């Protein structure tokens, strides 16, 4: 909507206060004009019609319980935009400052979040498996990263290409979480998963097996559930990414860590210059090796570490 840029204040899902960029025209809307062609947050009102209504507020104060998921979807979309722009010189998900749209309060008891081809969508959870999912910065960044993938490599959402798609969202979700630097970790979804259980998470990149996911290609799932295991087999790639960044010895194979920034540069280049809709795990290894070669040189530690990490997870 046409209006003047304003700054509201509110509380997120976890009870933390933050400022949000809004737009004033009669009401204050969750419309951030400071980033690209805008970040827009919508109320789905417990229904499944999308996007719903652009979020309108009378006073620019967002402290109601009902406001909290909207505050976080809006704010964390901003952080994710900033990460891609500042770290990778990418302007929004399409590289041309496309408007970023999110809807919250999707459906009832809805234990998921997704990119629907056009926008991000967040359930509130059922209060047992999840609280409102936009409360996780890694979750928000995971979702926006699906849009980046769809505009770039275009990894088909099934089997190995789909597991790579998933891992790319977990990797950049995590890198955005570290960028914001509030309780960062290599776990996925810990801030909004199982409020009655401390210390767990939906997935782990550092040890995928903790939550039942494979950490070696020999343990891959090849059944039909979950689009051929896209959220399961992602553990193999998540583990490789974790090892590239942090190092470790895994099934006897030692990897020298090169740090998060270099992990991000290598995987961003692979995603945008080498991966294709049908890439499999072996092709991802080749893309990552080539990306590291471009960035750091064929004889570099970085290239050697990429090879060690994929060896460690059984991907040749
Ligand atoms: C709930 C666990 C898992 N979801 C996830 O791991 C994350 C959320 C997480 C980071 C909190 N959601 P996501 O991977 O974006 C869900 N994917 C999904 O709905 O794919 C199907 C789809 C395809 C095309 C258009 C709309 C939807 C799942 O769907 O199995
Ligand atoms: Ca208000
Ligand atoms: Ca965390
Ligand atoms: Ca996390
Ligand atoms: Ca928990
Ligand atoms: Zn996903």
Q: Is there a single domain that holds both residue 140 and residue 38?
A: yes
Q: Is there a single domain that holds both residue 122 and residue 186?
A: no
Count the domains in the chain.
2
- Quickly tell me which residue has 């959402």 as its tokens: 157
227 SS3 class: helix
Residue 16 placed within a domain: yes
Residues 6+ apart with CB under 8 A from 26: none
Domain end (from 115, 131, 154):
154
* Tokens at 173, concatenated: 């979700």
From CA 233, how far away is CA 264, in angstroms rounded? 20
Protein residue with its CA nearest to atom 7 in ligand 1: 113
Quickly count: other Cβ atoms within 10 Å of residue 243's Cβ: 30
Q: Is 231 a known active-site residue? A: yes
- Quickly tell me which residue has 């950490």 as its tokens: 215
DSSP letters along 59-111, please? SSEE-SGGGHHHHHHHHHHHHHHHHHHHHH---TTTSS-PPEEEEEEESSS--
* Tokens at 305, concatenated: 């570490």
Domain end (from 103, 125, 154):
154
Give the residues surrounding ligand 1 with Cβ less than 6 Å away.
112-117, 133, 139, 142-143, 146, 157, 188-189, 202, 226, 231
Protein residue with its CA nearest to atom 23 in ligand 1: 116
Catalytic residue among 88, 105, 231, 250: 231
Residue 287 placed within a domain: yes
For residue 287, the Cα-to-chain-centroid distance in whole angstroms is: 21
Establish how many alpha carbons lie within 13 A of residue 7's alpha carbon, considering only the half-sphere containing its beta carbon: 3
Residue 89 placed within a domain: yes
C-alpha of residue 131 to centroid of ligand 6, in Å: 17
Asked if 230 and 157 count as a contact pair (C-beta separation under 8 A), the reply is: yes
Q: Is there a single domain that holds both residue 232 and residue 132?
A: no
Resolution (Å) of this entry: 1.3
Q: Is there a single domain that holds both residue 185 and residue 103?
A: no
Q: Is there a single domain that holds both residue 94 and residue 14?
A: yes
| Phi, psi torsion values for 231, nearest 5 degrees | -90, 0
Residue 257 placed within a domain: yes
Tell me which method was used to determine the 3D structure: X-ray
* Residue range of the domain that includes 36: 6-154
Q: Is there a single domain that holds both residue 213 and residue 130?
A: no
């Amino acid at each position: 909507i046409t209006g003047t840029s304003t700054v509201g204040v509110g509380r997120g899902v976890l009870g933390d206060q933050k400022n949000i960029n809004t737009t004033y025209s009669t009401y204050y809307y969750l419309q951030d004009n400071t980033r690209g062609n805008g970040i827009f947050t919508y109320d789905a009102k417990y229904r499944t019609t999308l996007p719903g209504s652009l979020w309108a507020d009378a006073d620019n104060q967002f402290f109601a319980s009902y406001d909290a998921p909207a505050v976080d979807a809006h704010y964390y979309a901003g952080v994710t935009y900033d990460y891609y722009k500042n770290v990778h010189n990418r302007l929004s998900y399409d590289g041309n400052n496309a408007a970023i749209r999110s809807s919250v309060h999707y459906s009832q008891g809805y234990n998921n979040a997704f990119w629907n081809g056009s926008q991000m969508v967040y359930g509130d959870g059922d209060g047992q498996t999840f609280i409102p999912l936009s409360g996780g910065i890694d979750v928000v960044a995971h979702e926006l990263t699906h849009a980046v993938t769809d505009y770039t490599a275009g990894l088909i959402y099934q089997n190995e290409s789909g597991a790579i798609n998933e891992a790319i969202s977990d990797i950049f979700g995590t890198l955005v979480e570290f960028y914001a630097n509030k309780n960062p970790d290599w776990e996925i979804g810990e801030d909004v998963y199982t409020p009655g259980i401390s210390g767990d998470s939906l997935r782990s990149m550092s040890d995928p097996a903790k939550y039942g996911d494979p950490d070696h290609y020999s343990k891959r799932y090849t059944g039909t559930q979950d689009n051929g295991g896209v959220h399961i087999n992602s553990g193999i790639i998540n583990k490789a990414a974790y090892l590239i960044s942090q190092g470790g010895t895994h099934y006897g194979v030692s990897v020298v860590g090169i740090g998060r920034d270099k992990l991000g540069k290598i995987f961003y280049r692979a995603l945008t210059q080498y991966l294709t809709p049908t890439s499999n795990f072996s092709q991802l290894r080749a893309a990552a090796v080539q990306s590291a070669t471009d960035l750091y040189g064929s004889t570099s530690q970085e290239v050697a570490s990429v090879k060690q990490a994929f060896d460690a997870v059984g991907v040749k």
